Amino acid sequence: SNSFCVVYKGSDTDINNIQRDFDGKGEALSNGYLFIEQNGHYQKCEMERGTAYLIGSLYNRTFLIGLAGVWEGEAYLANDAELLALLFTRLGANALALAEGDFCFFIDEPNGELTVITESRGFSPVHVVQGKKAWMTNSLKLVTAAEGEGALWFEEEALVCQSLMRADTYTPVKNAQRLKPGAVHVLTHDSEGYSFVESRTLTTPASNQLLALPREPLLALIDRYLNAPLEDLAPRFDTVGIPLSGGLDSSLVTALASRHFKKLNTYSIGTELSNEFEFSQQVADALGTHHQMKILSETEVINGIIESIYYNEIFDGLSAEIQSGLFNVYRQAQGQVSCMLTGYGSDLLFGGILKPGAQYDNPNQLLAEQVYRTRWTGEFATHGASCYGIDIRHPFWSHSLISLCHALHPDYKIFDNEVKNILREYADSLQLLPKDIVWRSVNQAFANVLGSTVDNYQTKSRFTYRVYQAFLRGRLSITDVTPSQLKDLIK
Template identity: 25%
Template sequence: MVRCTGFGLIVSPDRHNEVVEWPFAVQGINSTRFERIENLEYSSVIRGEENCVKTAYMIEEDIAIWMIGEVYNRESIWNTIIGEEKNSSDLDVDLLLNLIRLYGTTALRLVNGRFAAVIRFRDRLLLVTDHAGTIPLYFHISKNSIYVATEAKALILGGNLSPGLRKFEDRTFEQNMIETIFKGINRVPIGSIIEINLRTFEMKKEHHWRMPSERLVISEEKACHLLYETLDKAVEFQKGENDSVGVILSGGIDSSAITSLIAPKVTKLYTFSIGTESANEFEYAKLVADRYQTDHHEFLIREEEFLEKLPHVVWAAEVPHAEFIEYLTPVYITYQHARSFTNRILTGYGSDILFGGMLDPHMSIEELDNYIQRDVLSIDGSNEFTHTIGLVHGIWTTHPYWDREFLRITLQLDPRLKNLHGIEKYILRKSFESFLPQRNVWRKKIGVHQSTGTENAFTKWVNENIRGNEPLAVRKNKIIYNLLQTLYVEGANPDEININNSRVLINQ
């Protein structure tokens, strides 16, 4: 289990003891660390288990690092690069420090993982997210101070750094990839380094990961082998040293493939399915659970529970998009029920983006390739993969389909193979044809928000309560926007918000 669940940092001429009070959605207790380096004070709060500071913070000579997450290719980096320089350590923050010393900022190009970090290196402060930005990192720069945190609420409610939300109609923050819905609060784009000069406080952006543009020309058979082997390695990496893990299992090809790969690698595998009386995938999930003899659990939820959890999901996800909140709500509830069984869960999330699973299988190859590239970039700022949704319940989540190496291979794959014969995600299905029940391999894709009843419940509620001529999607987004306003501007507690409260329905 990752012991550190979040952190915040203020860099300024003066010490800031109040950083210990910064709020986080994720589980844990706040610990503080104060360092004076040259002429600046580094006041930090580290969220997580008691005594977790040593796993999240390290300083050695002119390098200091604050980090949350894990490095998946740790062993190969230690053995191949650092092993001759220093005895092996099980701390990823130590690994990152040694890489920075050897490679400077280009060290991040070597790292495959799920992490966010702040690195003081010489006269620079580096703000870093992994290749897919799966752990958000927010920041604010003033005249003589820098504020950073893994959750925007720490800066907004703890640091009093945002005067409110941008206007609902102002979507410019979605184009520049740095600004957020919160005024004055920025975020580090996916696969990027925000470099801040500690003398002038000037900022510039660099990339340590870019989406590949070239494509592989290989046969269907070789493509299947390559996908299977690369995903299997990603699952092995993301299992970590755990002998007991969980998988969210819908019975679709994405989660079923992950289940088939992880089952032989652990002594205890839990699988979890969620649904309502009117919409669920229990039948298909059970086929895979029975085949791999998992400890399977079905969670039957009232449709009203999805609405009741909306404020909590918005509080954790910190985004204004109803589309993503609808995806994340059933996942949030699943983690809530699964926490009594395991503290690490692998998901099948993100496969649809890479294989065009939600696109028209009959579109042209050119359209498909362009749409997939667009959809990959669209995750920037969506917080679809955010760690907070799981760590609110004490669960560390991983997403093998967005492992850096698997992501590279999948994006380079001939797009023709992804929708061959008019079958969406054809090559992924073909890769696991021999390892899963045929009903699971070839069943048509259904989104988690649809298969669990979340979308229907939210749509019904919006149509009954928010009348008008605006499109349904706009009305849904306004509800999420007003929830953000209630939580982050008015300072309400998500436990105290009733979705039918007038504060959520204002200005409709």
């Protein structure tokens, strides 16, 4: 949801500088400050070596509590910070990789040196930035708001927009470090007081051997893992928004959601009379949901793009373009729901990006690459939805489901001139969606404004990176983006 940052030996001035542009509150730590935006969540608890802070939220508390409850009865009533603290002290830092959520866990030790654990999927990207002072934050613009326009040093666009695939620790900010998701990090200072980050991954590469898991056990597993995220949200939400494209992924989420929540709000978007309203409407009627559409203009499409960049700090062309559809939905649902579920990521797990009937030497490898890519882009950041009063959730993106699909036999993902076979089989087994739907132009508009080809994501990344820098340096306002300013960034 809302962002946060920590500044080593920060001053009240640093905090007041941030609050002039970002609403929130500061809290003193042993040797510095902690700032959390107005809609941010966090919990704390005293530990043996210091105070533990858990910023953000947890998505699988039921699973986490079930785990700690194995040895500690107090897990059932522990706050987010206490819960992870139990896992930490009993099973070590590696156990926190088991938690899902847009969270960041850190222990504030007396010596000012803190130990931090970053969530392992990219729901909460964390950076360590070296400015006048050392900062740790999941929002680079907070550092600019505190230290000024020149705080972040950006790399040459030619060196940045030259590659589409990057390590999960990649950042275009020269004076910054992107903390690897799913790792423990200790923020030390040497004899002269210079910042030195000691990092260690909490996970190891999983086996790539084909997983020949029988059909029945597989379907039972998909069902349990897709519903778990919903069973966790149901208890605290009566209404839920869902972006309905009419496609299998979003339709499946709606079908499952109609069994956990009482009120369902579905939203559909199109462009240039090029849409899927036909199918989308059929799903809404089939399940009796509060449906409503909206045909986006070329202007609204670009707006969704720049908004995803501002809020989720996305500098990647492809990712910003895909996020456009979600941001236009947030705007339509704003004030109508507080929780949203999407079918996002399903194509990366079950083979939706594969070409039907085509042959692949290693389809799982091709997919795994895309699952990893999402770790650094910012597509999974929750800031955008938070600023719309929405708790965004992606049911498909759970550790258990992701791991299941990682090496799942391909014939389940691409077979007999079809894709996502096993998902479709699971879909109609619910007896909720019509065979028609189960089956068993943003990229263009974006290219249009830039004056390039639809497939040229290098020119699209050069533009997105442009607005990225302008937004993070504070020279562009998310509230005031004139068409002239946009055109300047284009050419």
